[PDB]
Amino acid sequence: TTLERIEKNFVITDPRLPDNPIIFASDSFLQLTEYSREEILGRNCRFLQGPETDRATVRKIRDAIDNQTEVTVQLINYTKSGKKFWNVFHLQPMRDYKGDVQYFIGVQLDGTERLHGAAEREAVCLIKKTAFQIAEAANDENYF
C-alpha cells in the first residue's frame, strides 16, 4: 500500500513546472515502455506517441490538462523499441486542501486491442481505482 509498492503503470507529473514533466514513474511503467529513469524523468509523457496515435484523442488529454479536470481515453502508444500497444489512459488531478492542482496522476492499462463493452467498463473501473490508491499512498507518505 506504499507508493513504490503499487504494481501498476503510472506516472506523476508537475503542471507548475515548464511542460508538465514526469516527476515519478513507476517500475511497471518503466518495464512496459522499456525506458529508464535517466531517459524520461523530467520529461513530458508525449514521447509515448507515434505515427498511428490519434491526434484528436491527444487533444482531449491536452484540453483536460488545460481545464485541470480528469479524463479517460483509449489510444495507441509506443515502447522505446517502437512497438505499438493500446493504452486505456486515465488522468486524475491531485488537488490540495484549497483545490489547487499540485500534481497529475496518469494511469496506463496496456493491451493489444481497443476495448468495448464490459471489457472497457472493467478497464476503466480498474484504472480509476488505481488512481485513487496512488493519491492516497502519495499523501500518506508525504512523498512529494
Ligand SMILES: Cc1cc2nc3c(=O)[nH]c(=O)nc-3n(C[C@H](O)[C@H](O)[C@H](O)COP(=O)(O)O)c2cc1C
Ligand atoms: C500525468 C500524465 C500522464 C500522461 N500519460 C500519457 C500516456 O500514458 N500516453 C500518452 O500518449 N500521453 C500521456 N500524457 C499526455 C502528454 O503528456 C500531453 O499532455 C499530451 O500529448 C497533450 O499535450 P501536447 O498537445 O502538448 O502533446 C500524460 C500526461 C500527464 C499529465
